[PDB]
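Write out the bound-state structure for magnesium ion.
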Amino acid sequence: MITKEERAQINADPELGAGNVLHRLRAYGRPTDRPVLWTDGTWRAPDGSHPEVITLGELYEYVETYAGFYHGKGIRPRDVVGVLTASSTEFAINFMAINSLGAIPSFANAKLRPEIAREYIRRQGASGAVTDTERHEVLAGGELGFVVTAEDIRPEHRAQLPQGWPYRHDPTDPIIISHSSGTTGMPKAVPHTHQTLLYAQLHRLKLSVGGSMGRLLVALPGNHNAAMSVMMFGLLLDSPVYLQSSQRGSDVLDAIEKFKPTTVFGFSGTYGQIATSDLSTRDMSSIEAYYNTGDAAHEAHIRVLVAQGSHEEIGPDFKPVRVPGSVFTDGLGSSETGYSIFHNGHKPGSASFGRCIGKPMSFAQAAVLSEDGRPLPAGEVGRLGVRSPTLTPGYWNDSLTWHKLRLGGYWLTGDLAMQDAEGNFYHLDRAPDAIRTEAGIVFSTRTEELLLASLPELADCTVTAIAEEGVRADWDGDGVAEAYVLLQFTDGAREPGDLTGWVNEVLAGQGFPPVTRALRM
Amino acid sequence: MITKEERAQINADPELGAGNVLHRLRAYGRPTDRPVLWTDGTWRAPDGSHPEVITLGELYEYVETYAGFYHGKGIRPRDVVGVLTASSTEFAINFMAINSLGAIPSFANAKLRPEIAREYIRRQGASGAVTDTERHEVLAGGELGFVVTAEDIRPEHRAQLPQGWPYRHDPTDPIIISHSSGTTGMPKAVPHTHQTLLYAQLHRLKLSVGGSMGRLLVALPGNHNAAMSVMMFGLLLDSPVYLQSSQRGSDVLDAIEKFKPTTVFGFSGTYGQIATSDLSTRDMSSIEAYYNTGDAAHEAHIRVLVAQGSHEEIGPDFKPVRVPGSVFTDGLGSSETGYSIFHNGHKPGSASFGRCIGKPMSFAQAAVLSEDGRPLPAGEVGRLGVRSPTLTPGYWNDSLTWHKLRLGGYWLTGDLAMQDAEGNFYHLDRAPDAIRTEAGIVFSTRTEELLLASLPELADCTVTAIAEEGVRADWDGDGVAEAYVLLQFTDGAREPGDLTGWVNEVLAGQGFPPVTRALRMDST
Amino acid sequence: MITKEERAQINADPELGAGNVLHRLRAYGRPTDRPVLWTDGTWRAPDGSHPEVITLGELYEYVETYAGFYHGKGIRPRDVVGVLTASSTEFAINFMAINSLGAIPSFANAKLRPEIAREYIRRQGASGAVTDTERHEVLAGGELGFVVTAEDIRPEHRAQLPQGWPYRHDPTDPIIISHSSGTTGMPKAVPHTHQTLLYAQLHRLKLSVGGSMGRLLVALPGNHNAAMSVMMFGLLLDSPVYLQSSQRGSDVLDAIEKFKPTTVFGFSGTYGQIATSDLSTRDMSSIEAYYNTGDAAHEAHIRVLVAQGSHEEIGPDFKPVRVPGSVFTDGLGSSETGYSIFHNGHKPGSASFGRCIGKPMSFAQAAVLSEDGRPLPAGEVGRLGVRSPTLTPGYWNDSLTWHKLRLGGYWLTGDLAMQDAEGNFYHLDRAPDAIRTEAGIVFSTRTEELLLASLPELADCTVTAIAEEGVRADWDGDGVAEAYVLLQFTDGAREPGDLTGWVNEVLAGQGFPPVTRALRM
Ligand SMILES: [Mg+2]
Ligand SMILES: [Mg+2]
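---
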């Protein structure tokens, strides 16, 4: 745990940031025999072993070796080095080592289409790259100056550590490039600086952190910058950090039972698999909070999860009382913002947030923007735009797209939203998921979810637009289209009653625009 | 309501501020015949009459006359001119006309005790002072270069208007002084600049935040800067404002029926009286929202009040829908903060119980401070300090007291508080009302409120700090005092035999630390 | 010329910027029948004429016609429109019209090689380009959406001016892309925003301009952003502005005699070419100031120029008294920093500056940097760094180069420098011109200059480094080379003997490290 002296020590350190957390820990003279992060043994250390618990001393050793190797291969400050791996621990070691020479680690998801990955990295102008074995063939044989794997980095390379190591980042110096998951086409490459990747975290520490933090289980996809964001925060707090790679419910559950984390970090899809598992055989007692990043988690999964473990609340005598149940926090955000900008907590008793994502974090500044970038008054639909010291300085090597996605000084998250009178924001939908129909704007995700939540005989359903030729009828667009729904029943109990009237009865109940027709599958 | 072009004009105005709103209205070319202020007939116009509805152009004419007049009395930029009156509209006219000269109008509560008012105004360095005919004797006969009343200002004085009028304020020039509302002996003079008084207002105007401020009924004590905040904000929005001077529940209620306001602004005492009335006789089909500052409004009242009128909401289709009920914003803050800092809306169905004041405004920044002046981890008790661009530059002519009420960069509100892990703030108590016994600290107003809904046979109780005949044991003091339970039984029965244990069981059942006795005074 | 009330109105305009000077001029109600722009007639107006003097109202007509045209061509905010012309006035009209749409005009020097012009623009992502007649074939027939010239823009297209015109720029919105002169290879595209391109001008407008900017002759190359800077500043001052396209000294001299400027703006090459001319036949009686951007002008020439015209010094009664001579201001600036950061004012009889350049403009921060980005103390040589609210946000679509050119939060000018203990900065040489020897650091240009100014039997000499192939020895390098000075004795010069010991004499007699060898040609 962190003392008050250490807490002051962190806040007093104007050099600390995303490029030197490891090195400031050494400057604080932290105990080096302390085990600091736990792994799923998916990363090969230089000695050939696959460490499952790593001490601060060994972390210095491993990072110095890697840094030595890359200097070896010619890596200088402001060079780009691709990291294409599935292993969270591998992401994290190459992240810190490349950082420490002043070069820029560029995370790619291991499961991009190989031509996409290859060209995604050529466009950054990278000097070379490291992969895991299964991805090695995706980059080797091309134009990169080196394409190595963990087997290539060996203890002798630690002797090549340059004079003056580690690098001394200015706040504005890039320390990572990463891309958001779930995209189509070429992912946009998002850089983050020494200052920005850690801003929100270091803001917390300047006052108080919530839920302590305890033992952190990082089950976020390791290519996402949040994995590094959380991991370094945990290193600073002297909280143990487990770097879980697989986003698969069962594997994460095995991790919870062996690591006994007090806080879990993950994506919706993982929380969903967990909440539909047979939890009655799982020791979740250690858990006190989950954080979810990216798309919001599903309220029925959340209800299953907050029932596990326990959290402390402020008692009536103003002292902590433990109570049954955990706290699941949804955090709307992006790779571009380096942290969540809005927060939505769910306790066991908590009420439905509906579509309300509340107010932005104090350091951020959001708005609902007209098409010409003025804020709209409460009650009107527009583009959600954020301002923040955690915001990226702009897509790597793509100025043109950066500024296309800026409006009135705000970055555009790509969501549609409105404000109420008290100044809370409401997430309506992704802009490209709005369909302009003659009944009005169908929000496809709101529709799909309302339907699935009202008709239990449906196993899935899907809104899809159908316009005339070439017509574009999303939010950014001009035209109109009809919105057809594709249903997928469970085991029976079909309502041949119109289908289309069946589903437009629900939509009408909520005031939603109807869909043109609803077809089974 | 205010149009798109109008708000853009107000956001593109780099001169707009609490020193010149009236003249910026004139600059935006607004219709001069529009009624813009509604009074209660307590202010004497320069023609002798008592107008009840003032239009924008008439308002130019009055403020010009009062400007020319004070100019004729020798008033220059950066002079103080005191304002001791009971009429909210009289506070208003003097505020803008004194401001329009670069001089700092200084508000003082009419009902202040004679020796206090005269001293408070004298230590400011005021060049003079205006009074309503009642409080005249309180300031006259002293060192003020003048002491005047409305009748002393005739139409003729309009021609005295200095060339170059009106003043061009710098953001950091002062435009008001005003004091708080607790007779801690001598009130503290709080100045506010061209920029701080309207900061919150203009920040929400730049972000279109707000809504449901069609007709504003300002029942705040006119001597308090917030009265001018709210009036000017309304002027800017082009929203009828009504300047109710008395906080008699009855009077404010008659105002709700005459003015038909959409938003109502007052101090807690007013709401406390209005809630406990026969609301069946009253016509409140206008009220959508309440605003309350100064004292926290007790939840038992707030629930009576959110019952009236209607307000819009976002229905499931993401369209506005009108629902019965009203919103009761309770915002903390103090005279020093210019605007409320924390906030606490309340609807018909409410759960924001329990001293929880929410989170601070985005432009502001709060903390729960140690004695070393550092922010605590959640769950720990300390002193609540704040930081804000709405904050005052510091107590007028009292720098010693100013820096004594500041810690680690924050201005201390003198409240104790704690945070939950989600960063909400809970208002334990005013630090004077803190008594450290043996077991732990017992919060006094919390020990007085734990005999409300747990020991229901008293119309009041108090906790007192009698240690030695002056040996303190407060939060800031380092000693141990005896906290006490002092009761008040109304007529009937209910009274048991034990004069000590009846108050100790409810305290132990809600986690509280020890009392030590109890008695029964008369009502004297 | 302009009043105090107009000057306060400007200084009180929170919307004034590089994207709407023309539109703010109208908001201020400037008279429209008044001339404001003088040309050399190299630009075809929409009606086919070639105006030589343009009223402010006629300017509104041209820009609106061009705005209506680009609007019907499909140009939307944040689009990029290449401008490839030799006409300053054509650069200027297009810059304002493409601005007003929210689109981004990209200037390119007309003399770029076709294979490079084509690609420089393609890399930006432009939707289209306008060219003068000569350069249409350079971009025509490409992947570009359109390639037009001024013959394509008739008065009809003014009817196409869109709803809501002109654009309302956020301070951070891009409003120009241009590049620098004197580069080899692919020039670097420098973008500037609504608030950076005019920031030094608006800031110096919080000081009395006093009337030294009475009639500006802008003879800077048209593709250069300084030329738009000076133009817009002049417009704001209600100072006539002449847009001379040619940099040939004789053409700028014909311009000086015609327009009778009070302040001239050029590049040192223009100035040199003027200073070496038979000034006798020339009226230059109107000049009170020259201004020179980028590279300092040869002080030899400067002396000849400040000889011309008269200026105004302050009198004992505190009203201005007119004295003979003029003021020539060197200002090391760049495309990236825009204005000059540094000012070196020369007037008649003033002392030579040597290698001093003074202190930076109050709004910028400059430093001599260690290789890890720390400011150095007086005495030591390091890399010259600059921070300024006038700095570009970074090269367009080339994040990689942008951060390669940054150090400890500063932008690198490319120069080596040191400070005296009084604060002033001294420019030693270009970081690629330093030669790492064992004689020490030999500054290529300083050695060349010293020799060519002390032993007058030379017309030119040249210092080059000779080291093992692959070894880099240029400050940025780690290895070492040997310095050779190749001598070119004048026609009939009394070519002596030895040589190596001849140059080593004069260069070691002023302190300079020794050269390895000296040969001829
Ligand atoms: Mg909702
Ligand atoms: Mg979808």
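---
The CA atoms of residues 215 and 240 of chain A lie 5 Å apart.
The two ends of chain A are 55 Å apart (CA to CA).
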